[PDB]
Design a protein around this nucleic acid. Structure first.
Lengths: 267, 229, 293, 11, 213
RNA sequence: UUGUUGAUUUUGUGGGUGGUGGUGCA
């Protein structure tokens, strides 16, 4: 019902406003059943069009959007639909810097425990969000903590004490993105993504170091990726070359039940 | 503690020109430059390469060494401040020719092609870029003052003058003004080539200084004073 | 066979012997698949010599080995598509190890290491890990990828994901970790487990195919030992070490609370406290660019 | 892009 | 006193002009130059780009003419790319013109010493390490290295010791010529520096640090 | 295999060397 609500049901109603409670209940659905956790994602599409058509307000709407984002969102198949809706939400001209900063901090925290495909999706998404809202580059880079060669010795001492007393103020459990204090934090997680094992993912993760010359990144070129694409890409390597071997030698490849390559794995 | 600006990306600082008089800058003038051309083809007169010809001209060949001008231009141009777009170079040839040196230029480091450039410059009155967009080296009308900034402090390099610290001097000078330095590329002579234009003459070190060494020492202080790095 | 067809004897012997760098590999993997619990010691003797032989054949015919190896990763992937974990066996586990022995693991890109690391990460995530057999296979997979990165020290997010679910699997939920997606709630360790006896942390491969409480504990200890090593080598250097270890810290804290006697979670927590204390968690600074001339 | 002590092209 | 390699106790500013492209070729032996000898070097097969002894002259001139040399706190060492190591007496006054310099260096390379009536220029045996002061800090000039204030760097450094700076007169190459002797590499300016300007920068800082004036 | 000759070479696999070198000395 929710999948087809926005297209095949709502336009045919004489007064579609009566669906607001049903969509609101669908959007607020919280259940222990895992298969029922996707319901708010579907209700969002039907809920969004209603506000657009009649200019309704859902109370603390962006707060619930922040709540819905979770580690499950990146793995569900309907992530593409949600992200397309998110782009419209985060294209608004009245969003506060704290709100967008709260989102970006949470996604970066989520990308930490994510597959490479989701990391490939988020990194351009964060780049677009940071570029859209220029107040948030503090989140990537805080200049007050830079060590400048010209800074006088007293500034060095003040900087040293400032470094010592700093504490990360972002709250993960707070559900109000305007109150998570994410704007005062930093994205160390992306800097950890810089050391991702996959080389291309690292290159996308290195993108935050280099200047933001490019205006925006097409999400359509990064949304559709998965493990199979990476494995399929290597299955077809255009160039073939002699591999580089290990000069080191191991007497035994597994541990017993001299040199063992895999201690803890009996043979 | 503070949010970053709208655009942090480093942009090339504006290329200073004689037309702009407002921006603070460090002006250097290599006065009494020994640059002369003569047909043998036209060649820049040199102390060692040509000795008979200058004797026929009747000029003292001791003051016939354009390499001192070459070496200074190399250090002035290669100084970090020039890379920072806070320096323009002026050249008063001993004959009275005043030359504009665009900061963007890249003079050759070999002395022969150095001379080949100036024989072209002296006769053609100007030099055009390889890409043909801007005249790097241009001759300009004397006096120097009209080309200098509206508010500018003028000084010369004088061995006899009191020794000063360049970094302290530039700091105590105002900000809107500019500092203009008159350096003698001459080998030896009286330090009165630019007495008319300057207001006060300063010494940099107690020991005698070569023109390039004095210039390099001066610019480093400006970079230290202005935090050019 | 090598003696009878040396390069000098006749033309084409080089190409033939190269095809045997490939064949002998599928023999190495085949023998591992075969049952060897009866004669593990003899199987150890025949194995290491056969692997030692494959080193010499590889050294001269690296190209043929990669072609056969890459066909093997392609084969495992295709078998994984239809059979999932049932395709996986000891030989696939052994094959990944032989790749580490012979091929330059510590490279940004490599013909055989990169597919192996990616394919193993797919197992580290996609596989349910809902059985002691399946968890044991994942535990060794963590060991192999850990040795793949022993110099490189690159971050593998799936190592974090695997540790979180396995740690939470053996404590099943506590109702405090909803962000972690479990696949089996019936593997929770009983409370009566002593956790003071000296239990070997080594997991036999021959037992893996056959796959009670002690075995779960031994597998669990091996996982945490890999977790402790990962903290001590990779995650410490990363800028976001506190973020990486915070979900793990909560899980280990749950382990200590439920099993006070169990010391390993306390030890890891103590080291984690030491690392976070020393590491200076300073606001990240990456946009500082070099001025342009 | 010329840098350091690299010289202008010789033809 | 004129500083010499024999004396090691005194603090001094040592400058090593590594990868110096000085070579003599006879058709009479003459210093190879990028512009004077293009066809001949093309026959040799070496690129004319790395055939510039001129850079060494500029570094030598600014260093020798620097005030610190006038204060007798500087010694210059030159490591030719061919592997020849040259000692420069601080008292010398090398020719200001490039051509007269080449005639000097061909003599030094062939005669192995220049004596005018102590050898003004003396070829000495490698390695550099033996001749340098017993207690001495070694650094190279590296663009990729962190930018450090020369005045602060010398000030924080000890007094009985001496400071070595390895500067690459090479036109182009990797900054690993003297990695074997050095302990750390530092950046002098935030911008790319020529060999001459960096030497001018560094001796200026030492003059400020040591109050040479 | 040779410019008619006969095991000198030819094919594959491994494989070291600046060397009709110069120059100064006893």
């Amino acid at each position: 019902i929710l999948l087809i609500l926005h297209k095949r049901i709502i336009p045919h109603f004489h007064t579609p406003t009566k669906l607001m409670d049903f969509l609101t209940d669908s959007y607020n659905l919280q259940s222990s059943n895992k298969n029922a956790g996707v319901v708010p994602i579907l209700a969002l599409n039907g809920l969004f069009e209603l506000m657009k058509r009649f200019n309704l307000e859902y109370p603390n709407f962006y707060m619930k959007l922040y709540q819905i984002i979770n580690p499950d969102l990146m793995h569900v198949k309907y992530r593409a639909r949600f992200f397309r809706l998110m782009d419209v939400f985060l294209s608004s001209t009245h969003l506060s810097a704290h709100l967008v900063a709260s989102f970006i901090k949470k996604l970066a925290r989520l990308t930490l425990e994510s597959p490479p495909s989701a990391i490939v999706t988020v990194i351009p998404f964060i780049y677009n969000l940071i570029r859209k809202h220029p107040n948030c580059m503090i989140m990537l880079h805080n200049p007050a903590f830079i060590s400048n060669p010209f800074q006088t010795p007293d500034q060095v001492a003040n900087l040293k004490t400032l470094k010592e007393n700093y504490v990360d103020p972002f709250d993960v459990h707070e559900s109000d993105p305007e109150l998570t204090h994410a704007l005062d934090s930093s994205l160390w997680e992306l800097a950890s993504l810089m050391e991702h094992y996959h080389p291309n993912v690292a290159t996308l993760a290195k993108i935050f170091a280099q200047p933001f010359k490019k205006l925006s990144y097409n999400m359509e070129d990064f949304l559709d990726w998965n493990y199979d694409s990476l494995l399929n890409a290597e299955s077809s390597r255009k160039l073939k070359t002699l591999p580089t071997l290990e000069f080191e030698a191991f007497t035994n490849v597994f541990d017993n039940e001299g040199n063992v390559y895999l201690p803890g794995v009996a043979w | 503690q503070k949010a970053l600006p709208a655009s942090l990306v480093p942009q090339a600082p504006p290329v200073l020109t004689s037309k702009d008089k407002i921006t603070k800058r460090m002006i250097v003038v290599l006065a009494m430059a020994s640059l002369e051309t003569h047909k043998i083809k036209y060649v820049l007169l040199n102390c060692d390469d040509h000795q008979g010809l200058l004797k026929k001209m009747g000029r003292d060949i001791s003051e016939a060494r354009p390499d001192i001008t070459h070496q200074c231009l190399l250090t002035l141009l290669d100084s970090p401040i020039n890379k920072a777009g806070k320096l323009q170079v002026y050249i008063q040839t001993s004959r009275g020719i005043l030359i504009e040196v665009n900061p963007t230029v890249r003079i050759p480091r070999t002395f022969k092609r150095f001379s080949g450039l100036m024989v072209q410059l002296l006769h053609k009155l100007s030099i055009r870029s390889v890409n043909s967009e801007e005249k790097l080296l241009k001759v300009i009308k004397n006096p120097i003052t009209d080309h200098l900034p509206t508010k500018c402090r003028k000084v010369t390099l004088s061995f006899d003058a009191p020794v000063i610290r360049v970094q302290d001097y530039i700091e105590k000078l105002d900000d809107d003004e500019s500092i203009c330095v008159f350096v003698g590329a001459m080998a030896r002579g009286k330090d009165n080539f630019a007495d008319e234009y300057v207001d006060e003459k300063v010494g940099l070190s107690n020991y005698p200084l070569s023109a390039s060494v004095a210039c390099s020492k001066f610019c480093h202080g400006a970079e230290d004073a202005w935090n050019i790095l | 066979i090598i003696k009878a067809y040396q390069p000098k004897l006749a033309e084409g012997n080089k190409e033939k012997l190269g095809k045997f760098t490939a064949v002998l590999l599928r023999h190495i993997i085949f023998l591992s698949n075969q049952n060897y619990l009866k004669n593990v010691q003899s199987f150890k003797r025949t194995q290491n010599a056969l692997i030692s032989i494959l080193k010499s054949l590889s050294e001269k015919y690296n190209r043929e080995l990669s072609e056969e190896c890459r066909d093997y990763i392609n084969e495992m992937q295709a078998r994984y598509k239809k059979n999932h974990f049932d395709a996986l066996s000891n030989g696939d586990l052994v094959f990944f190890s032989i790749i580490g022995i012979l091929f330059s693991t510590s490279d940004q890109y490599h013909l055989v290491i990169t597919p192996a690391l990616i394919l193993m990460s797919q197992f580290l995530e996609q596989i349910k890990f809902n059985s002691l057999k399946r968890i044991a296979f994942g535990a060794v997979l963590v060991r192999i990828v850990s040795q793949y990165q022993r110099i490189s020290k690159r971050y593998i997010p799936e190592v974090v994901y695997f540790f979180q679910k396995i740690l939470l699997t053996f404590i099943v939920k506590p109702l405090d970790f909803e962000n972690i997606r479990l696949d089996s709630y019936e593997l929770g360790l009983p409370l009566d487990v002593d956790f003071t006896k000296k239990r070997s942390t080594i997991i036999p491969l021959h037992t893996l195919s056959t796959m009670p409480v002690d075995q779960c504990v031994s597998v669990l200890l091996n996982v945490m030992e890999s977790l402790d090593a990962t903290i001590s080598t990779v995650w410490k250097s990363l800028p976001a070490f506190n973020e990486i270890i915070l979900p793990i810290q909560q899980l280990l804290s749950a382990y200590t609370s439920k099993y006070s006697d169990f010391e390993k979670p306390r030890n890891i927590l103590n080291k984690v406290e030491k690392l976070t204390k020393f590491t200076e968690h300073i606001p990240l600074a990456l946009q500082n660019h070099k001025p342009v001339s | 892009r010329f840098k350091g002590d690299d010289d202008i092209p010789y033809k």
